[PDB]
Amino acid sequence: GSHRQALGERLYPRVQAMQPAFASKITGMLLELSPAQLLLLLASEDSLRARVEEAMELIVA
């Protein structure tokens, strides 16, 4: 969708800074969260880190 793409564009380099190799996969996963959780991700470095690591071990297990 047009809106989730804009979200994804803002989120992507931030995820890439922490997971250069899986940024595309992780961003797409992240974009399935509730609006509320997405907002929090945008607003909060620490909150995003938590989701990114969450996403990481869902992938590797």
Binding site: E9, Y12, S24, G28, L31, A55
Partner: peptide
Amino acid sequence: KLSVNAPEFYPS
């Protein structure tokens, strides 16, 4: 709930 089946995202 995070989802290994989500589509991959593609920047521009």
